[PDB]
Design an enzyme around this catalytic site. Sequence first.
Site, PDB file in Angstrom:
ATOM      1  N   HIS A   1     -49.701  62.987  16.324  1.00 40.89           N
ATOM      2  CA  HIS A   1     -48.248  62.941  16.407  1.00 40.89           C
ATOM      3  C   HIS A   1     -47.595  62.332  15.171  1.00 40.89           C
ATOM      4  O   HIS A   1     -46.387  62.120  15.231  1.00 40.89           O
ATOM      5  CB  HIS A   1     -47.779  62.196  17.659  1.00 40.89           C
ATOM      6  CG  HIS A   1     -48.668  61.068  18.080  1.00 40.89           C
ATOM      7  ND1 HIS A   1     -48.408  59.753  17.753  1.00 40.89           N
ATOM      8  CD2 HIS A   1     -49.804  61.055  18.822  1.00 40.89           C
ATOM      9  CE1 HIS A   1     -49.350  58.979  18.272  1.00 40.89           C
ATOM     10  NE2 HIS A   1     -50.209  59.745  18.922  1.00 40.89           N
TER      11      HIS A   1
ATOM     12  N   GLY B   1     -45.596  50.892  14.830  1.00 44.03           N
ATOM     13  CA  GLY B   1     -46.318  51.207  13.617  1.00 44.03           C
ATOM     14  C   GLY B   1     -47.795  50.885  13.654  1.00 44.03           C
ATOM     15  O   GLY B   1     -48.476  51.059  12.637  1.00 44.03           O
TER      16      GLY B   1
ATOM     17  N   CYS C   1     -50.025  52.481  15.480  1.00 43.60           N
ATOM     18  CA  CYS C   1     -50.831  53.648  15.817  1.00 43.60           C
ATOM     19  C   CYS C   1     -51.795  53.990  14.685  1.00 43.60           C
ATOM     20  O   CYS C   1     -51.485  53.828  13.504  1.00 43.60           O
ATOM     21  CB  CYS C   1     -49.937  54.845  16.137  1.00 43.60           C
ATOM     22  SG  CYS C   1     -49.006  54.649  17.692  1.00 43.60           S
TER      23      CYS C   1
HETATM   24  C1  LIG Z   1     -39.826  57.225  27.173  1.00 45.79           C
HETATM   25  O1  LIG Z   1     -40.834  56.806  26.290  1.00 45.79           O
HETATM   26  C2  LIG Z   1     -41.581  55.712  26.734  1.00 45.79           C
HETATM   27  C3  LIG Z   1     -41.249  55.016  27.893  1.00 45.79           C
HETATM   28  C4  LIG Z   1     -41.998  53.913  28.313  1.00 45.79           C
HETATM   29  C5  LIG Z   1     -43.100  53.503  27.589  1.00 45.79           C
HETATM   30  C6  LIG Z   1     -43.431  54.210  26.406  1.00 45.79           C
HETATM   31  N1  LIG Z   1     -44.442  53.993  25.545  1.00 45.79           N
HETATM   32  C7  LIG Z   1     -44.395  54.875  24.582  1.00 45.79           C
HETATM   33  C8  LIG Z   1     -45.379  54.940  23.437  1.00 45.79           C
HETATM   34  O2  LIG Z   1     -46.258  54.140  23.356  1.00 45.79           O
HETATM   35  N2  LIG Z   1     -45.180  55.983  22.469  1.00 45.79           N
HETATM   36  C9  LIG Z   1     -46.078  56.125  21.341  1.00 45.79           C
HETATM   37  C10 LIG Z   1     -45.807  57.440  20.607  1.00 45.79           C
HETATM   38  C11 LIG Z   1     -46.184  58.659  21.453  1.00 45.79           C
HETATM   39  C12 LIG Z   1     -45.738  59.938  20.751  1.00 45.79           C
HETATM   40  C13 LIG Z   1     -47.691  58.698  21.713  1.00 45.79           C
HETATM   41  C14 LIG Z   1     -45.873  54.995  20.349  1.00 45.79           C
HETATM   42  O3  LIG Z   1     -44.784  54.536  20.135  1.00 45.79           O
HETATM   43  N3  LIG Z   1     -47.066  54.514  19.682  1.00 45.79           N
HETATM   44  C15 LIG Z   1     -46.955  53.474  18.677  1.00 45.79           C
HETATM   45  C16 LIG Z   1     -47.552  52.116  19.050  1.00 45.79           C
HETATM   46  C17 LIG Z   1     -46.599  51.537  20.145  1.00 45.79           C
HETATM   47  C18 LIG Z   1     -45.415  51.154  19.655  1.00 45.79           C
HETATM   48  C19 LIG Z   1     -45.054  49.803  20.411  1.00 45.79           C
HETATM   49  N4  LIG Z   1     -46.467  49.137  20.657  1.00 45.79           N
HETATM   50  C20 LIG Z   1     -47.229  50.188  20.911  1.00 45.79           C
HETATM   51  O4  LIG Z   1     -48.568  49.965  20.694  1.00 45.79           O
HETATM   52  C21 LIG Z   1     -47.355  54.061  17.327  1.00 45.79           C
HETATM   53  O5  LIG Z   1     -47.723  53.405  16.422  1.00 45.79           O
HETATM   54  C22 LIG Z   1     -46.712  55.395  17.066  1.00 45.79           C
HETATM   55  N5  LIG Z   1     -45.401  55.400  16.847  1.00 45.79           N
HETATM   56  C23 LIG Z   1     -44.829  56.642  16.610  1.00 45.79           C
HETATM   57  C24 LIG Z   1     -43.454  56.856  16.350  1.00 45.79           C
HETATM   58  C25 LIG Z   1     -43.013  58.145  16.124  1.00 45.79           C
HETATM   59  C26 LIG Z   1     -43.921  59.214  16.171  1.00 45.79           C
HETATM   60  C27 LIG Z   1     -45.282  58.998  16.430  1.00 45.79           C
HETATM   61  C28 LIG Z   1     -45.735  57.698  16.650  1.00 45.79           C
HETATM   62  S1  LIG Z   1     -47.263  56.994  17.005  1.00 45.79           S
HETATM   63  C29 LIG Z   1     -43.317  55.741  24.787  1.00 45.79           C
HETATM   64  C30 LIG Z   1     -42.699  55.290  25.986  1.00 45.79           C
END
Ligand SMILES: COc1cccc2[nH]c(C(=O)N[C@@H](CC(C)C)C(=O)N[C@@H](C[C@@H]3CCNC3=O)C(=O)c3nc4ccccc4s3)cc12
Lengths: 298, 291
Positions: B39, B133, B135
């Site tokens: 992603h 950030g 991920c």
């Molecule tokens: C209605 O949406 C929600 C409702 C309720 C709980 C929720 N949780 C998440 C969720 O986790 N999303 C994933 C991303 C998804 C696509 C897998 C995400 O933000 N991963 C982070 C690590 C996160 C951030 C906070 N500390 C965590 O470890 C990462 O680094 C990434 N950032 C992005 C930003 C933009 C694009 C790609 C990426 S990949 C969404 C969500």
Amino acid sequence: FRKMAFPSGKVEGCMVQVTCGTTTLNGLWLDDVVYCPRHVICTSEDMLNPNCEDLLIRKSNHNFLVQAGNVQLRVIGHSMQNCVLKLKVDTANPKTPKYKFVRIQPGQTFSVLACYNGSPSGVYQCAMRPNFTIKGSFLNGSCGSVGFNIDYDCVSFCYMHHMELPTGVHAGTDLEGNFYGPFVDRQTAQAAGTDTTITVNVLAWLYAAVINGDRWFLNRFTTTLNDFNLVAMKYNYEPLTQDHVDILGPLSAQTGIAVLDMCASLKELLQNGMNGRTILGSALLEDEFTPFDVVRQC
Amino acid sequence: FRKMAFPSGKVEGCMVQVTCGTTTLNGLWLDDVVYCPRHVICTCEDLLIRKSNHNFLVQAGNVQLRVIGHSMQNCVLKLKVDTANPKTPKYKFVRIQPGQTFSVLACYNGSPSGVYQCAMRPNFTIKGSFLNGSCGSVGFNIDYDCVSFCYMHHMELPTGVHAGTDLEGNFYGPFVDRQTAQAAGTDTTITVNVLAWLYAAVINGDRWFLNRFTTTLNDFNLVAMKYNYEPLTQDHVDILGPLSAQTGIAVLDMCASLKELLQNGMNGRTILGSALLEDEFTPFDVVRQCS
Ligand SMILES: COc1cccc2[nH]c(C(=O)N[C@@H](CC(C)C)C(=O)N[C@@H](C[C@@H]3CCNC3=O)C(=O)c3nc4ccccc4s3)cc12
Ligand SMILES: COc1cccc2[nH]c(C(=O)N[C@@H](CC(C)C)C(=O)N[C@@H](C[C@@H]3CCNC3=O)C(=O)c3nc4ccccc4s3)cc12
């Protein structure tokens, strides 16, 4: 909240082994100097009656086997600084990071890289107790493992490991060889002072709870620092220093809670107990997270 | 006895930054391939065919690496670069079992930030510490200079626990890589690990919870299931053999101590400084540290 160590790679690149006679411990190779505990020169018949400064006169450069892995580093000079030996070698370590030697205060945390025979084994965070011990995980052969902080790629070395106390906690020196606390490097059962709770870190923990929305313990009271310190001591909490007040500034600004107001909130918790309630999901207050550690994770 | 991560240096030398459009996360650089969460292309299959090699900016510290190809494997993107990583360790990709532990190297903008130990929970989450950030940060074990990568970070659940994939891009658990609020299955406690940690406490001179009683394996398991603990198998009993040999406490004797702990509580007392039963140390974690 997790106890998080610093990434250890910049220190891993500095670890070597130092052997004198039959005893091997760890050393720290920075530029063309290797730092290690001076008692590597000790035999089984010393240690009890350390003749270290006089033992050193009988030793020469060719008595020291310094190895990076199994590659030998030739020693071209040697000297003693307090409880550490400094071995000058003929090769500057190409993996030397930007670094400083710092002496820390009780309450400060640092990462320990536990090493055996020059080989890193594991990494974990420690806090210097007010009685100048740490709750380490060290076995036979760990001496010379170091503790450190990393800020903007500069490694601040603050600990070198020397001793386990009978109670199972650990004692050591800074990198200038000066012990933290009243310990000496003898083969001898030593006692630490009675420990106390690290007040500045408990306050940081309460700020962390407020940041995360857990703030029932806030009240409409304040205190002077002196009044609080005198109450703190009656509950085996450390008295606060001006420096403690100062390092709580960033968290105070972030939450809008004056430091002395937070002290008054802790004073109530100390006098009235938790009433079965929790803070950050616990009836126990945590005292091994510093203000810097809290902003690191928040 | 301390929660102890592996030295992270071999992994730090593999961490890079990957940016695509407005999205930046971490990647893992091994030989001439960068592995990162797919992603990174989101602001995925139709979306990937529309990307060119030059849409990806990969940086190792200051230097940029040139992307010369790309493929998708499940939820992981594999970027082929024109430079081989000279610090590539001997490595393997492994899918870990629930209850096993690993070290996490949390990274931001390609830079390693902290290292800590995690367990794969029975409900296939991990209790980590990850921010925006993070991920692409990875989890791993080290065995005689060989790094076994087992985890790549993707998601934080509403409960604050974390979800991710193996290095083949397949999630642990029923999660998907979408911006949605997702719930995990009901978690349970890792019984074999609690017993390992009680043995650790005995090796470290803590015995107030020991008793004279014994239990059968089935009777222990009846109580364990009642308290939402995982079943203890004979293979687990076998695995605890060395720790039983060292301490001279039979495994089912320790089980009797755990049963009383579960039915009575700790009465304010602590075990290895903890007020809660700890289940994130494996028997190997105890052994490798106590000896
Ligand atoms: C209605 O949406 C929600 C409702 C309720 C709980 C929720 N949780 C998440 C969720 O986790 N999303 C994933 C991303 C998804 C696509 C897998 C995400 O933000 N991963 C982070 C690590 C996160 C951030 C906070 N500390 C965590 O470890 C990462 O680094 C990434 N950032 C992005 C930003 C933009 C694009 C790609 C990426 S990949 C969404 C969500
Ligand atoms: C009656 O004597 C005792 C009674 C009650 C408790 C006690 N504790 C100690 C004590 O600690 N001695 C120091 C050594 C002294 C000289 C500073 C010591 O063994 N350090 C270890 C780390 C230790 C080992 C176990 N895990 C700990 O961290 C270390 O690496 C070193 N090994 C050697 C081996 C040979 C030569 C130098 C060194 S230096 C003695 C003692």
